[PDB]
Design a binder for these strands. Sequence first.
RNA 1: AGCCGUAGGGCCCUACGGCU
RNA 2: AGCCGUAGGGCCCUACGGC
Lengths: 670, 670
Amino acid sequence: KLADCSSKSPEECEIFLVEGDSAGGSTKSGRDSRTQAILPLRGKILNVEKARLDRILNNNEIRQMITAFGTGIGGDFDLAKARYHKIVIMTDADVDGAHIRTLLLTFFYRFMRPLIEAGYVYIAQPPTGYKGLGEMNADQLWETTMNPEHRALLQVKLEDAIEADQTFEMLMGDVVENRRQFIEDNAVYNERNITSEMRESFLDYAMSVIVARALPDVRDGLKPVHRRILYGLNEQGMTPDKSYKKSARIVGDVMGKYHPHGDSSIYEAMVRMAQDFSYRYPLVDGQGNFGSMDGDGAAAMRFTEARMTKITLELLRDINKDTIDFIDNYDGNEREPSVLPARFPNLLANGASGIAVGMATNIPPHNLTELINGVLSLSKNPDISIAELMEDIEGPDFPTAGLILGKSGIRRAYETGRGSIQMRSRAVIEERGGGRQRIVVTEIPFQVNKARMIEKIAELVRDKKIDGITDLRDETSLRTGVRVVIDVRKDANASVILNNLYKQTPLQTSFGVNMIALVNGRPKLINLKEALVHYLEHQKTVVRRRTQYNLRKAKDRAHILEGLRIALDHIDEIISTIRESDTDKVAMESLQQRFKLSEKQAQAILDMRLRRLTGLERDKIEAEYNELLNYISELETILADEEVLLQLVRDELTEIRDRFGDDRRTEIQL
Amino acid sequence: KLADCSSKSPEECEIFLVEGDSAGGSTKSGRDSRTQAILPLRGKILNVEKARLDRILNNNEIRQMITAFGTGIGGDFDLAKARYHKIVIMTDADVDGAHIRTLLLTFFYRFMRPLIEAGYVYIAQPPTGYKGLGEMNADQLWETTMNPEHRALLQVKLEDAIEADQTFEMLMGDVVENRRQFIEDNAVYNERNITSEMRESFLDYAMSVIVARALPDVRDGLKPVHRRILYGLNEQGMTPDKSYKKSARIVGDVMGKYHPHGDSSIYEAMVRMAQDFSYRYPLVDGQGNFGSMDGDGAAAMRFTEARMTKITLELLRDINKDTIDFIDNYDGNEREPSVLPARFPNLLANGASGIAVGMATNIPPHNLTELINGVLSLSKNPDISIAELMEDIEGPDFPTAGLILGKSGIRRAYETGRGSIQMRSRAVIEERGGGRQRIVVTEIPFQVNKARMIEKIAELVRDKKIDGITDLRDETSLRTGVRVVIDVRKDANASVILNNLYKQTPLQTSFGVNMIALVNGRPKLINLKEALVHYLEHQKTVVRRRTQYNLRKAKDRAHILEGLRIALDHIDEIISTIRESDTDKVAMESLQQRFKLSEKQAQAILDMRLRRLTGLERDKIEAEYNELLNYISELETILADEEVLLQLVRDELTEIRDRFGDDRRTEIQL
RNA sequence: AGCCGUAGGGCCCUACGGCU
RNA sequence: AGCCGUAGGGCCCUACGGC
Ligand SMILES: O=C1COc2ccc(CN[C@]34CC[C@](C[C@]5(O)Cn6c(=O)ccc7ncc(F)c5c76)(CC3)OC4)nc2N1
Ligand SMILES: [Mn+2]
Ligand SMILES: [Mn+2]
């Protein structure tokens, strides 16, 4: 895949390392084919500091780079054989391109150390605000990054090798804690030194993954991709009353406007939100093949269609009533929400699963009715214990139902944010004829792949690791629901076979609770009370801001009426004033001075259509004015009393509990 | 890839053959897993009538069907070893689904005939307008086509065995003329016989590819995909004055609204429209990596950006002025143009190429100044000969320039619609020093891969197929342009080496002209005059319709201004009437009666804002009316005389020729 | 192990006609 | 023989943390 240069003189020859063919093309078009060679990689390169030699040497990209440089690796390294005196790292001008840069430096430091020592390793500086080099025109890439007469390359420099080994060990190694400690210690919410570069690039990547990718916000329970999808459907009015909309139109729109990442990242996030076995309260309503519990993926996006579910309307309720802060998108062309109003506690209701850098999050879904009664209880007692909260919130409530073994794990997770929860399958022992029996499984644990579990059981039988099993079939149908049958050998104790299946297969699975979520844009391990407290404050803020909006909005309307009232009373003198005016400006000025009107009032009059001059309009204006004055009072009453505001939040949460609250699916066996 | 059923009694067992995994997933979810198995294929299967036996037996999808059926092929076929007593073909409910069915039937007929004889082969009947089965929910696919209670299956019956043998060789064989004749003769503009199925399904497909895919319309020179891309850019304001819009937004929009096919087909058609080496007059203006002359493809659609070129504004000019006919899109939720106004001769300016069924198209690009001059000469003389047109139209004009050898092939092509055009590269012989020489190539033939051409020269040198070549280099760059160097051995005759390169390499390429375009939605082999006659007809129609639309609209606006003028003249009376009326209906009824106004006139007065009563606004109304009366008079002139209409078409083509007309690139050599 | 879910990145089989 | 351009269809490597 190497697009080598014509020359054979390494001293004048250069090799550019790009992320793939999309960047490679632009680079191949702009380059000097005489002295500049191109090697397109394939995205994220292997982390050699975490991988063993067998994996390193059987890797396609690693192999290709060694063959391109001709020096060999490690012990057998020979700088004389170097085919290029310039190895230039030209990854994309984004957080993931910085990660691939740290990955390439890691491989040059552990396998090609004298290449850095000779100053042969350089870092290209393409301009920011592109998605990739593939977004650049050939001419723009030459002049800014490739022309030796105008480019600015950073030559990689190695100073203290003890400091370098420690940095590559800390940032790239297998020990997560030291990496987590570096993020905590450093995170703030032409030649280059290899240590400073690794630390800066890796920190940009880690901070980006943590605050803007893998972890959900504590207020709305969403990760950036999900929030962008829901905001996307909302903006294009893809509400439940409207028809389904083409998946590609949704994905295309969201990619261009809010999410500058791969289509598959966007589309798979939309798919999961539509899966009744993934989401306890699904956020997307899908039409077509959206996958199954057997690991089957969704159909290609050209076949599927989607829209919002009714509960999603509750997450987006009052978004245009200045309840949430808006921010600029990635390119400054659009505005996006920083958080959603979230009228129901979505973090805990739907849960979250995220693998970040230096940490991970594993939050289980819960029952909406239980959560809401918990929030209601907390609003009535700020000093409520986790034990009192557990009277309302019994434990997680998986979409796939099943069983949880005791309150011990649950209790530990709700008090510390960490705990192991044993999930069991719903399995019964029934007779099948002729004095024979069978095990019937109708509920499997959360996130357990049904077909994969069936194969692990078959494996255990074929490899003689389990006694008593004659046959196993999957009888699942849309009619019957999940139905896995395991036939027992006549006279064999089916209960013994079942307990052996719980201990040796995904029939019994564990859920490692690790409640990490963003609190004030920062990752934080929180407990059940902390999570509810942050959600309750978000509601109080959203409701306060909605009331403040309406009040400003109602006071502006009342002021417009005061003026329209004045216009209808002095209609003939108003018309006369406009008629005798040469321009709009003169008319504005004259109406203001004569009738004691403001700029807005005069503008409202000038905008008034002739049909507003009808008989039942002065009565209409006065009817609206009076009702508005009542409404202004209702709003001022809420803002004056914090207890009234708090009751308003409770009332609205109670409506949501009655409209959306369903029964518990998962049995917590004591 | 087989998703087998629980049962092992073939007599009750059914095997469903689907297009791929998107359809497969809906099928796996909706089925009865006990008696129904699924075999997801991978799109179009091999054509066993045109393929050599060795290719058939090593083909992955063919192997998978034989393995699944467990019968064996041809002579080693055993109906006793049949794993299912029902082989159900369930392709998508579209033209390509019909093709895959004809492809499947052919393999069953030539390799597993007793399977048809036993009445084991069936045809499922999924509901029409979905794109794929993956667009449907499992329960919908179960009830409509998979449930034995409600389904309507067609059992394939083989009646006449001589008729079937002859049918399969006609539709699926290598002899095109038999297939072309069948299309021509048959084109129109529960048991089932295998011959009737093959004929209907093949005609479905063949017809679709001919009128709705592979052939350009004679009027706008576009194929459905190109037309839908350009219309998509117009309906999204993706004009040259505006900024580049993301390719993914364009793709998703076009696919969802007008083109029900793969995104690779839409994106690749848009890409080609943006390449200056493919389009004589590029239709798309691309930002980023849009591919090269070396066969390099464009960047993934998430990286690229695009908009209309200035020339495309001329293809779409006045589309929203009732110039062309709109039709319903594929699903009856959108409107799409049937043809574009096409203010310049696009078919001949950009050319076309497309492989259809029973026929193909191959039209070369031409120079815009020459084409317009040709149309102008034709407008002044309906009886003009091809030889006289050839005074204006010298011949094709490739974007990649080069040379054409003689007028003989050109003359034949313009007179019959068919001819062989000999194209040559622009190659010179020059000195390089020390008595030695080289061949410099600076222009290569049209649609020739530069890199592949170099490798062809390289392999001739290596395998000693050519003599005298010491070196071969691509010295091309953005700066220099195309530059290929072939170093000659000292004292060797370079012109001899050159003539040899022209005989043995793509350095000399023929262009087989085959002018097949859609004339009245029917494919026709047309010559030069016919192509321009149909273009001119279309322009006369567009400009007339535009004038007729502009007259209706101006007459509707003068009418509304007549009403507002009456109101400005009797303002106090108008106000009185509105003020006295209790409702908007009573006001409208009174104004119509009191001032002899129409319903439209009265509504316009009621909609009038107070700001229209000022001096400047009062004058605007009068000036617009006076401007409009002159415009109506100018429009009526155009419609009174046909020579004035034709002069307008001529003056509009002269404007376009002066603005877009450029120099000829391809040299026509005697 | 290798899986979970957001991210980086690309490749190859088929049909169809007319030219070589 | 195999390329040209709209069409049908889908796979597999990489990072990252916890168990
Ligand atoms: O924003 C929008 C709007 O409109 C759209 C409609 C449809 C689509 C889906 N298109 C695709 C789907 C898979 C794809 C990558 C792919 O080609 C698939 N694939 C395989 O299935 C198997 C092997 C393989 N090996 C290399 C390779 F590059 C690819 C492979 C190619 C097209 O990447 C994106 N995307 C958009 N995006
Ligand atoms: Mn990138
Ligand atoms: Mn299909």
